[PDB]
Design a protein around this ligand. Structure first.
Ligand SMILES: *[C@H](O)[C@H](C[C@@H]1CCNC1=O)NC(=O)[C@H](CC(C)C)NC(=O)OCc1ccccc1
Ligand SMILES: *[C@H](O)[C@H](C[C@@H]1CCNC1=O)NC(=O)[C@H](CC(C)C)NC(=O)OCc1ccccc1
Lengths: 300, 300
């Protein structure tokens, strides 16, 4: 037993991380087969990064302006192109460590693991959720751009996130691996800011089921509620509405614990209206919303 | 910016994990050079595991009773021996993926990353602290024994923990890699239970410094306190006493933020006496004690 925020083992991704330098900008790239993917802002200078025209900036570059280092081996760049907000650097060597992979775009409310990297060297691994407002609450410093987020199913790495920037509130923004931003954000200097966020209700419910599986039962009750009455409470507390599909997704956890989904909703209603009264659930004094139902089943 | 519970990248350890079967018991082993290390209870049966005599149990075994699988390759066991609570299985092939490594024993209050594994296959990675009572609050199911904890410095893996058991409160116990238990626990069936735990004060202080570095300042004050007066409060709230060595270790974080250690102690005294009044620090409504000063410096 026990329940922890757990990342996927990172080895398969560590073998794909490289360093990309253009001018005085250093960041990370992802080396899959004979292509290195990286944020296109690697080509910008301080002056450009106000309102850059990336198509102009890139036509002024040559293959030799991109220095790619895979550990202690220089990779020779033989072609370059832009795809949305990522650059694709063709190199003369296919990565022999390329795993089976896919490029997937995730939905708000879904989780993934982040391999934070600096100078092409992995530094740490942690779990993130894509917030309803399309930001992530990560841990990223200068040099971390090009770090990736991913899930692993069987032997296949599904890459979902590449890191590009930090917003004024300290949260993080980036793109899918096709270079399309999550959320209404752009890789240039504006006053852009995260929009209002909400709590991921289906995930809070999943985490309450994880708590019951692990022996925390104090918040349970015999009462029940209707889906409509629960969603009235959710709206008041800035929680996302619960759909019948969410109820269906929680079915397996409800069956395992014998607690009907709408009974757990009544427990959550009481927690929202009364707080915890100095108690904790799975080591937290707040309701946690960054575990999906799948994350709970995977671990419990 | 941002601050997350972050594990070390696990690749170097993933390449060392194997499956060990003896009889009907399956668990994990650690394959370094031509030795596989695993919990000695792999040789027990249901009846034995009450009060086993491991020396007797092991003399009745042969090399061929140990089946070792490295991915989809069977390793041939050519010798076996017991070292404290671990078995050392000599195999006919040195692991070509053996990293530079050390076997270190950690202290209570120190952190490490855990690579949870089942059937010799890594499942997830997370950070743990060794509690003052020599347990860890992990996430381990049947089959997870032999999973290891480790830190990485430069290119060298310092293995510190091998998993053996779960105590009645749901916390976890295990040994160093020389097979010596952390804490007063034994690999047999008794009514053994975790002793009383305390909060790791130096780590709470480090995490408060991480909060300031990341823009949370509401708990700061102009007041200060004496070390003796603070330790009177620590005792009342079941916090470990703060030593001058802890103050020295916090020096760099104090210098970076300009907040003297004893000023931060005054803030902590107020948080202990008054709580948070509905506010949060780094996304928590509780005081977090599983980040060391080094963990904070590493990330911030
Ligand atoms: C790429 O390494 C970098 C990652 C940032 C740096 C601080 N925290 C991160 O996540 N990205 C940028 O510096 C980015 C470049 C634009 C052309 C998209 N701009 C950015 O994040 O600006 C905000 C900022 C910069 C430095 C510190 C704090 C916020
Ligand atoms: C080895 O895989 C296993 C790990 C346990 C199983 C449940 N959670 C864990 O961390 N260790 C044992 O089963 C261990 C064997 C003794 C001979 C040391 N005994 C143990 O942990 O017993 C308590 C327990 C067993 C099963 C479920 C819950 C608690």
């Amino acid at each position: 037993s026990g329940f922890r925020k757990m990342a996927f083992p990172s080895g398969k991704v560590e073998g794909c991380m490289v360093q990309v330098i253009c001018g005085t900008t250093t960041l990370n790239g992802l080396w899959l087969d004979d292509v290195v993917y990286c944020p296109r802002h690697v080509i910008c200078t301080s002056e450009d990064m106000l309102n850059p025209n990336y198509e102009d900036l890139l036509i002024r570059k040559s293959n030799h302006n991109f220095l790619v280092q895979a550990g202690n081996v220089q990779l020779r760049v033989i072609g370059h192109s832009m795809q949305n907000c990522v650059l694709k650097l063709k190199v003369d060597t296919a990565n022999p460590k390329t795993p089976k992979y896919k490029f997937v775009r995730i939905q708000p409310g879904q989780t993934f693991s982040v391999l934070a990297c600096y100078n092409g060297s992995p530094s740490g691994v942690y779990q993130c959720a894509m917030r309803p407002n399309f930001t992530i609450k990560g841990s990223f410093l200068n040099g971390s751009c090009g770090s990736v987020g991913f899930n692993i199913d069987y032997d296949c790495v599904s890459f979902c996130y590449m890191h590009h920037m930090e917003l004024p509130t300290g949260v993080h923004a980036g793109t899918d691996l096709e270079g399309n931003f999550y959320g209404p954000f752009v890789d240039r200097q504006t006053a852009q800011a995260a929009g209002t966020d909400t709590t991921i209700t289906v995930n809070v419910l999943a985490w309450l089921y994880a708590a019951v599986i692990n022996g925390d039962r104090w918040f349970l009750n015999r009462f029940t509620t209707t889906l409509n009455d629960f969603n009235l409470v959710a709206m008041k507390y800035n929680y996302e509405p619960l759909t019948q599909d969410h109820v269906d997704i929680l079915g397996p956890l409800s069956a395992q614990t014998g607690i009907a989904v709408l009974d757990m909703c009544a427990s959550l209603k009481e927690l929202l209206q009364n707080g915890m009264n100095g108690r904790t659930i799975l080591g937290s004094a707040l309701l946690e919303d960054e575990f999906t139902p799948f994350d709970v089943v995977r671990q419990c």
